[PDB]
Design a protein around this ligand. Structure first.
Ligand SMILES: [Cu+]
Length: 99
């Protein structure tokens, strides 16, 4: 599944911001517009047992050009909250349900 970073209209959003994927499906976060963006998972809002450092970008790494990607496959079932570091305080966050 592809998830865009930034809406075409400049909105600070993941697109889609909530979605479900079967365990193991590769999620491709694709830098779209109004960057910089990046993608991290929230240690306080993932399934028990998940280590968010293995599935997040480094906080200092920013995608600054359209078409860059960050790709991850989530294997543990449950809810995961991801966020963009620059824009987390502007509501650029989302939720994937791995089933
Ligand atoms: Cu962002």
């Amino acid at each position: 599944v592809d998830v865009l970073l930034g809406a075409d209209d400049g909105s600070l959003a993941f697109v889609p911001s909530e979605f479900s994927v079967p365990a193991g499906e590769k999620i491709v976060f694709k830098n779209n517009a109004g960057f910089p963006h990046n993608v991290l998972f929230d240690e306080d809002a993932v399934p028990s047992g998940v280590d968010v450092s293995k599935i997040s970008m480094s906080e200092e790494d920013l995608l600054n050009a359209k078409g860059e990607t960050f790709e991850v496959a989530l294997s543990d079932k449950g809810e995961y909250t991801f966020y963009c570091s620059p824009h987390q305080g502007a509501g650029m966050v989302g939720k994937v349900i791995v089933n």
